[PDB]
């Protein structure tokens, strides 16, 4: 996984 | 266990750029993140940016965007950063790390190096 | 971009002490999904590389004695520990891991008295 478990990953295409 | 090796120290001539070596074991290489954190002498820690070794896709701090460039060889597990016209400045201890699983905290350190920069 | 102040930036103590110290965020670390604090801390000695103590504000990492305390919430945290040991001896940062980029604040040192 590259979606990190930030709350908000801010500046990322993981939305 | 983990492990996260590097070099203890680097001398870096001004302006020459510099490869910092982190190999990685103990975990599946290819499917987490190794970030780079930089400490100046006395000074606190400060992200500089990370690398996935599944295919070498890389998010820098942006405040470093022109400055550190990672790269990754899946052959020998080690994830390299350059350091481009390097000065004085740029004399610190620079450690890799790795994160909890998918978890942003650093869990995995390695023992830094120690860049020199003079000619 | 999240920014990290602590304080106090050393602390003069005796071994036994309990000790405080404080990391306040400019922004809330609390996500609201899972009522958590996106806050993590770590421990420094002389040389060596930071050690990772609590994350989500108040979870010790394995291995982590339980006289290591994090507590707050929001924008204010603390990092207490009940009985100061001479190992204890170190600096401490707090880090924010609630979103990219990754920011720590510049520190608190302990150091014995005399």
């Known amino acids: 996984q590259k979606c990190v478990f930030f709350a908000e990953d801010v500046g990322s295409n993981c939305g | 266990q983990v492990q996260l090796q590097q070099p203890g120290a680097e001398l870096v001539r001004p302006g020459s750029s510099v490869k910092l070596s982190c190999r990685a074991s103990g975990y599946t290489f290819t499917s987490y993140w190794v970030s780079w954190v930089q400490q100046r002498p006395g000074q606190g820690l400060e992200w500089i940016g990370m690398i996935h070794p599944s295919d070498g896709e890389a998010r820098l701090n942006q405040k470093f965007k022109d400055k550190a460039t990672l790269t990754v060889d899946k052959s020998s597990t080690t994830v390299y950063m350059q350091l481009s016209s390097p000065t004085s400045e740029d004399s610190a201890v620079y450690y890799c790390?790795?994160?909890?699983?998918?978890?942003?905290?650093?869990?995995?350190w390695g023992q830094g190096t120690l860049v020199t920069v003079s000619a | 971009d999240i920014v990290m102040t602590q304080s106090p930036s050393s602390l003069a103590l005796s071994v036994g002490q309990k000790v405080t110290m404080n990391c306040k965020s400019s922004?809330?670390?609390?996500?609201?999904?899972?009522?958590?604090?996106?806050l993590a801390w770590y421990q420094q000695k002389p040389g060596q590389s930071p050690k990772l103590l609590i994350y989500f504000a108040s979870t010790r990492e394995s291995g982590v004695p339980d006289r290591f305390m994090g507590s707050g919430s929001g924008t204010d945290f603390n990092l207490s520990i009940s009985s100061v040991q001479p190992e204890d001896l170190a600096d401490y940062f707090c880090?924010?891991?609630?979103?990219?980029?990754?920011?720590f604040g510049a520190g608190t040192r302990l150091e014995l008295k005399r």
């Open positions: 880090q924010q891991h609630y979103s990219p980029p990754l920011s």
């Open positions: 922004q809330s670390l609390l996500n609201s999904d899972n009522q958590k604090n996106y």
């Open positions: 790390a790795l994160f909890d699983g998918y978890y942003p905290w650093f869990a995995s």
